[PDB]
């Protein structure tokens with residue numbers, strides 16, 4: 442399921458912003 | 462005449478903001494007036510801590526930024542935007558700045574302590590919000606953006622990590638590091654990958670409409686429990702966004718889906734928020750039909766979630782972070798650069 446894939450991803454923690 | 466007294470409220474708010482924007486407050490406290498207790502969060506250049514103002518006994522959150530670190534990463538102009546904008550704004554859903562100052566080493570901003578923790582923390586724990594719950598938060602953000610954009614401000618970092626839940630269950634938007642006062646277009650490649658509008662990824666140069674795209678991302682994320690575009694590496698995420706194929710959970714109502722299809726619209730001539738009727742396209746939308754915009758602004762709607770708060774200065778809605786003794790150098794660093802702070 443999409444939820445299971447999200448939970449197994451490395452993107453469930455706090456997300457930092459980017460800069461060039 | 463409904464959207465006539467919004468016009469008038471906002472005209473007076475512009476007048477208030479301009480006075481403070483043109484003549485910003487500086488040096489209204491000192492570090493030694495505050496006892497530091499606990500780190501409530503971090504970022505590249507510093508942290509935000511629970512503090513107690515000792516002359517009043519009031520608690521606040523104090524952002525601390527290391528001047529040399531800000532310069533190393535080429536963020537001088539953004540940190541000056543952050544503080545300048547924040548001292549000038551005043552909306553019920555924007556964290557209030559009480560004091561700001563600097564010393565030899567750091568920049569400091571002392572805001573209202575918002576004890577409920579980040580929406581992020583709660584969103585990940587419950588899994589996902591129901592539509593009425595997400596609607597409640599979403600409307601606060603609709604109004605905040607209406608407020609900011611009328612002052613020519615773009616916020617540019619909408620996400621659960623930045624929405625603090627206060628003692629009545631309402632939102633306080635924090636972290637204005639990427640906020641900017643612009644008329645016309647701007648070009649900085651900044652933001653959080655999952656939330657970036659397609660035009661940012663493509664170096665088009667963009668406007669306040671990227672905030673409306675980000676609203677679409679948030680609503681989805683609150684209602685699904687995950688965002689519409691994720692993958693393990695940012696580049697994979699950009700590929701998904703630029704294509705703009707969104708799939709919705711089978712449980713999203715058809716109204717919600719239609720709202721999102723309009724917010725996550727790669728075509729700027731079709732995207733809600735960006736058209737002839739601007740924000741009313743969102744407010745009069747069917748998914749918001751149960752929403753009483755004035756009652757939201759006034760905080761009279763009962764929140765569907767009030768956080769447990771066991772005393773002032775309690776931090777159990779926030780995570781633990783490694784602490785670090787502040788050190789203030791004997792020599793001034795980066796003085797000319799941050800003179801306006």
Ligand SMILES: CC1(C)CCCN(c2ccc(O)c(C(=O)c3ccc(C(=O)N[C@@H]4CCCNC[C@H]4NC(=O)c4ccncc4)cc3)c2)C1
Nearest residue numbers: 458502503504505506507508509522574575622623635638
């Ligand atoms: C993306 C970059 C690496 C490069 C480009 C610009 N960047 C940037 C810009 C402006 C900045 O002020 C900073 C920071 O260094 C910084 C330093 C500290 C924080 C910080 O701890 N903020 C917390 C935690 C992150 C999630 N947002 C919520 C925020 N918490 C609160 O603001 C809060 C306020 C009141 N009560 C409770 C909490 C956030 C940002 C970083 C960083």
